[PDB]
Amino acid sequence: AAPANAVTADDPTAIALKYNQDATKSERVAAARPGLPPEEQHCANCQFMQANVGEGDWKGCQLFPGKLINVNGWCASWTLKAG
Numbered sequence: 001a002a003p004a005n006a007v008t009a010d011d012p013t014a015i016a017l018k019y020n021q022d023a024t025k026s027e028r029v030a031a032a033r034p035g036l037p038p039e040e041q042h043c044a045n046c047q048f049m050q051a052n053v054g055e056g057d058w059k060g061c062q063l064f065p066g067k068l069i070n071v072n073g074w075c076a077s078w079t080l081k082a083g
């Protein structure tokens with residue numbers, strides 16, 4: 001059960017960025033974002049995930065203010081966690 005503030009499917013930014021809470025049901029391969037092979041990309045290893053926001057598998061994403069993403073999700077703004 002997703003948190004009340006989870007990013008959902010008719011969120012306009014989620015649609016534009018092709019977010020899915022489950023990276024295995026994402027188009028990460030098509031996008032081929034740089035930094036890691038696409039099959040290795042998900043929110044946990046993304047620069048925009050906020051480790052101090054949320055709880056458990058439901059964490060912040062800087063791009064979705066006031067909401068939570070799933071650590072096992074993906075979107076097209078995936079960028080390697082570099083610092």
Ligand code: SF4
Pocket residue numbers: 019042043044046047048049060061062063069073074075076077078079
């Ligand atoms: S920007 Fe990164 S952390 Fe935020 S939803 Fe997209 S992949 Fe997940």
